Design a protein around this ligand. Structure first.
Ligand SMILES: [Mg+2]
Ligand SMILES: [Zn+2]
Ligand SMILES: [Zn+2]
Ligand SMILES: [Zn+2]
Lengths: 51, 49, 97, 263, 45, 66, 48, 44, 144
RNA sequence: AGCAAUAGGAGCUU
């Protein structure tokens, strides 16, 4: 398994680590339940792709 | 840089309306009034002031 | 900067010579600029976000030039249509009616 | 010649009819009670440990907005006319608040009743936060979870509502006169008829409606004024009214003093 | 030296500028300084 | 965030009424009747209590970091 | 305004704005002027 | 059976938003990307 | 994201003309349209070589040059200000030094506060970046 | 007694 690179992950998508973790653990992970995702985190900055 | 350029001794802020000002009066904030300045040559009529 | 100093006051865009006029200073608190309401027509200004620029003349020749050529009272009548450009507006008109 | 007719009188509000006075007098009284009657309110907050979710100036604003008993505040001095340095005992009231949540379930509410008066110019009856009853819990100040703590030292001082609304003894001073528009001081907007489309004043039955045969009177001035003072519990309604009158009296006496001693 | 705190496990401790940045109890990666000791005044306005 | 102490417009103290308002709402009473019993008669005071959104409950759910 | 400008000069014409503004603003402060939803409503016959 | 009212329409719309939310296009696009697009680009 | 204000539509005193608007000072005093503001400054240490790196530290005048015109008297011994401290404009909140390549051999790279803003320090964070060098985030707070 | 540049993007008032 050759490592070919790292792909940024869209928050609240099926590959995000927040997709599971119903509200209690979301609160424990410092994540707002109202936050809907749909963006990326690059160097700690939230980025959204404009259609 | 030649037809137009940036200049010193200028200010900018939001404008407001004042029914109690005269037509040729402008109300200047205190902070801007202290930041901006006018050079006044000292003479024998304005030395005390 | 002190009371009655002539300063050039200006709003962009400066479409005609009466968009930039010389005003007498009155020092006030509360960081906005204050304008008599009849001069908002030549500037095409209103009070919903607008900002205007103030230029301070640094010599006596420029003070005299401002006060004797660019002063607000001297621009009431315009050469564009040989009619006044400053009038009574926007509540004084309704109230005087 | 001035006359008062109280219509309703409880501790928090008094409803009264004022008569045989000029409208300027009645309006000056309304303004004085709204703006220039001194009270006591927290004017300086000292945070020791605040680990609650609320911010420090949020809590400070809320504490400053807490009504305190101000019955004896008139025998007290303004903190700008005292020789003392950092607050003494005679021109300030010092309060303490200590709150803490222990356990890992539930939320502990921090109420204004938890404020504790420590010092103050005794035995003056000032300083205590106002409670409605014996069983009142007071005002909500903050909420606390596990291990969160609030440690605050508040100072209370004398001030008026001109400087800041937290010193206002009054909430709303209802005020009206001439329910039937006999003086024609208003000119009713209408679509079809101005009499059908406008609700009656709550003091309409206190005055005779104009007769259809009546002509307009150009001698009548306003003479009866119906006003309802309400308080926040810091002062009582009769106290608010009487001290508004006294404050107005002392303002006029100050003017008279300056005039006489300007000769 | 100066007091710090973990961001994950809320542990209190104090580090002295030469050890790495870490928690004792858990070993977590992010730490926050502690509130100052001075006294802070607010105007309640 | 948390119930304001005073009414913005007139200054009546409403900060001591939020819990009573919630208790009135549990037994089924509609908002106008609850506001009537708390003796909020002016619509400024009424909209003070009627439009409050209590966000401190949401802010308190994130574990204290001390 | 044009007449006063032409006869009296720019200073008197400038002061005219202030005089009229102050008088009318005081009168309107103590008279009042508003607008409401009812000022845009015509009666039934006009609607017909 | 009775006439569908406006409130019935808002119930239907609440069902729609309960399912999809407000950013479902972003999430579904990215899920499609990571499920199929990367592998297809590798096999192009 | 708003508040239900009580609004009158009137030509009251002439100060609401041309989209101006009169607001009650007492309602402002009781908290109408009052808001918190949070500004966060960031800074980290870079590696210019083998043993040449930056350091978070209060820069003493003797060993450092080109020091900013603000005050440094608020930094602790670690070059970081503490949360809970009042800060004015031009004040330093993160002290940092960059070594002079080949006493008195250091220049400063400190981050001052913005010349316009007042406020109170809220949350001084400290961690390490992707490459293991020290990393600092400082969140300020104020009320508008 | 000394506070970089170049770009892109989003905005303010006409
Ligand atoms: Mg505009
Ligand atoms: Zn004293
Ligand atoms: Zn830890
Ligand atoms: Zn109210």
């Amino acid at each position: 398994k050759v490592h070919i690179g790292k792909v940024p992950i869209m928050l609240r998508s099926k590959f995000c680590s927040l997709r599971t973790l119903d509200e209690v653990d979301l609160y424990k992970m410092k994540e707002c339940p109202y936050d809907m995702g749909g963006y990326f985190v690059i160097n700690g900055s939230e980025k959204v792709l404009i259609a | 840089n030649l037809m137009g350029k940036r200049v010193d001794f200028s200010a900018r802020t939001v404008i407001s309306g004042d029914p109690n000002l005269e037509l040729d009066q402008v109300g200047v904030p205190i902070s801007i009034a202290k930041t901006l300045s006018y050079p006044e040559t000292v003479t024998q009529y304005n030395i005390h002031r | 900067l002190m009371d009655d100093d002539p300063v050039l006051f200006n709003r962009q865009p400066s479409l005609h010579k009466m968009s930039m006029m010389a005003h007498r200073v009155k020092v006030m608190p509360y960081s906005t600029f204050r304008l008599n309401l009849s001069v908002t027509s030549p500037y095409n200004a209103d009070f919903d976000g607008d900002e205007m620029n103030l230029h301070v003349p640094q010599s006596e020749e420029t003070r005299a030039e401002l006060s004797q050529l660019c002063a607000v009272p001297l621009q009431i009548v315009s050469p564009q249509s040989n009619k006044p450009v400053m009038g009574i507006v926007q509540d004084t008109l309704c109230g005087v009616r | 010649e001035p006359k008062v007719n109280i219509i309703n009188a409880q501790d928090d509000e008094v409803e009264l009819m004022l008569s045989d006075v000029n409208l300027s007098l009645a309006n000056s009284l309304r303004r004085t009670m709204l703006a220039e009657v001194p009270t006591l309110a927290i004017d300086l907050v000292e945070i020791k440990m605040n680990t609650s979710v609320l911010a420090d100036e949020f809590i400070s604003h809320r504490l400053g907005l807490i009504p305190l008993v101000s019955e004896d505040v008139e025998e007290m001095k303004y903190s700008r006319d005292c020789t003392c340095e950092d607050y003494c005992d005679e021109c300030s009231v010092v309060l303490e608040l200590s709150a803490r949540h222990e356990g890992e379930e539930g939320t502990t509410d921090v109420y204004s009743s938890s404020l504790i008066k420590v010092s103050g110019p005794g035995n003056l009856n000032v300083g205590e936060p106002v409670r409605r009853d014996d069983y009142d819990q007071g005002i909500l100040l903050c909420k606390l979870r596990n291990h969160q703590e609030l440690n605050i030292r508040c100072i209370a001082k004398k001030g008026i509502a001109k400087e800041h609304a937290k010193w206002s003894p009054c909430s709303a001073i209802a005020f009206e006169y001439d329910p039937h528009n006999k003086l024609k001081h208003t000119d009713f907007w209408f679509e079809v008829d101005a009499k059908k489309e406008w609700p009656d004043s709550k003091y309409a039955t206190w005055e005779e409606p104009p007769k259809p045969g009546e002509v307009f009177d150009y001698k009548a001035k306003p003479n009866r004024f119906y006003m309802t003072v309400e308080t926040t519990g810091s002062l009582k309604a009769n106290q608010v009214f009487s001290r508004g009158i006294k404050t107005l009296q002392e303002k006029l006496a100050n003017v008279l003093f300056e005039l006489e001693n300007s000769r | 030296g100066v007091k710090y705190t973990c961001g994950a496990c809320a542990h209190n401790f104090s580090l002295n500028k030469s050890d790495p940045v870490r928690c004792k109890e858990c070993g977590h990666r992010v730490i926050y300084k502690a509130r100052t000791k001075r006294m802070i005044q607010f105007d309640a306005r | 965030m948390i119930i304001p102490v005073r009414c913005f417009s007139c200054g009546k103290v409403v900060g001591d009424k939020w819990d009573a308002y919630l208790r009135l709402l549990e037994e089924g009473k509609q908002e106008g009747d609850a506001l009537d019993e708390l003796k909020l008669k002016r619509y400024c005071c009424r909209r003070m209590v009627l439009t409050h959104v209590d966000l401190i409950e949401k802010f308190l759910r994130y574990n204290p970091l001390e | 305004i044009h007449t006063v400008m032409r006869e009296k000069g720019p200073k008197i014409c400038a002061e005219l704005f202030g005089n009229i503004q102050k008088v009318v603003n005081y009168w309107l402060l103590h008279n009042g002027f508003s607008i409401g939803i009812g000022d845009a409503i015509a009666d039934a016959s006009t609607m017909k | 059976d009775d006439t569908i009212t406006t409130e019935d329409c808002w119930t239907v719309i609440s069902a729609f938003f309960e399912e999809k939310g407000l950013v479902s296009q972003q999430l579904d696009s990215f899920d499609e990307f990571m499920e199929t697009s990367i592998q297809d680009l590798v096999w192009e | 994201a708003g508040q239900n204000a009580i609004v009158a539509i009137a030509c009251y005193s002439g100060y609401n003309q041309e989209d101006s608007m009169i607001m009650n000072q007492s309602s402002i005093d009781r908290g109408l349209f009052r808001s918190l503001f949070f500004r966060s400054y960031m800074d980290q240490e870079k590696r210019f070589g083998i043993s040449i790196v930056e350091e978070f530290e209060k820069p003493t005048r003797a060993t450092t040059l080109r020091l900013k015109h603000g005050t440094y008297e608020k930094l602790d011994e670690d070059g970081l200000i503490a949360p809970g401290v009042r800060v004015s404009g031009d004040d330093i909140i993160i002290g940092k030094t960059t070594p002079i390549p080949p006493y008195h051999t250091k220049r400063d790279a400190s981050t001052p506060l913005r010349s316009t803003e007042n406020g109170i320090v809220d949350q001084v964070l400290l961690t390490t970046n992707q490459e293991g060098l020290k990393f600092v985030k400082v969140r300020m707070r104020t009320t508008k």
